[PDB]
Amino acid sequence: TQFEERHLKFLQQLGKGNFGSVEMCRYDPLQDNTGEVVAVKKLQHSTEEHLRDFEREIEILKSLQHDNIVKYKGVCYSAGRRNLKLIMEYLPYGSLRDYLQKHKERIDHIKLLQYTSQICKGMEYLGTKRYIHRDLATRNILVENENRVKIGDFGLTKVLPQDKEYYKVKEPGESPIFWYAPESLTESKFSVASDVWSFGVVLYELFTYIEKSKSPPAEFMRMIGNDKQGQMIVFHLIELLKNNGRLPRPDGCPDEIYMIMTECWNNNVNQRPSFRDLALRVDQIRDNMA
């Protein structure tokens, strides 16, 4: 179904991605405040390239039907400018980053492994359609309810070429460098295996309970030295990762799960596990616990 702009009532700001801005809106065509509450993404600046990149994101999300990926509802077109609005489902519990930071240890290990399994399954499905997410982090995972999370923001997602198994970005923008694999830092190569590296950093995030001093930015900056600034942070991070400098074992993190993190953080690209293996292994761990 099509979404008319006039009937889309603003309620509040939800957040901001890399490029866009996400709002909570009511699609109220009857004009009695009874209509459907939805999430609405729109571009902040609407650049020459960004409008084409945002169209690509819309087509990516529209083609993904999975329980652990956020649901495309529609689009809303406007005027001669052709300014696009992406209509998505509203997930009321917010980002997994904020949700987990609010509750902390009251979310037990069994709940974290359920979220871990769901993130794997979402990512494995994403891999079958040859999409590389390039931004897997707890701020981009969203909570539908207490037993269910979904992968949210596909703003930096790229389609692989037919002949190749990496995407090489030539002119990169803002980059989450503390979630990036060494090959992404050195050569700007992004593949399924570099998304697996980022999944390891998500598993770290989850088992740290989003403690501020224990975050990947905080910990990597401690190892390289807080004195490092700008492009020198990238230089010294590359050398650290090349010499087996890793994020530490989180407080009270079990053995099996810390082993998964480190296998994901392998300098050898081909030795990293597949998302199919990671979903099986995490499910086996949950079966053993419960």
Ligand SMILES: O=C1N=Cc2nc(-c3c(F)cccc3F)cc(Nc3ccc(C(=O)N4CCCC4)cc3)c21
């Ligand atoms: O529902 C959604 N559909 C898509 C979508 N994207 C994002 C998103 C993202 F994925 C990446 C970056 C930035 C973003 F905003 C967030 C989002 N929902 C919510 C965001 C914040 C709250 C919340 O903490 N609240 C609400 C009031 C009291 C506290 C609740 C919901 C949705």
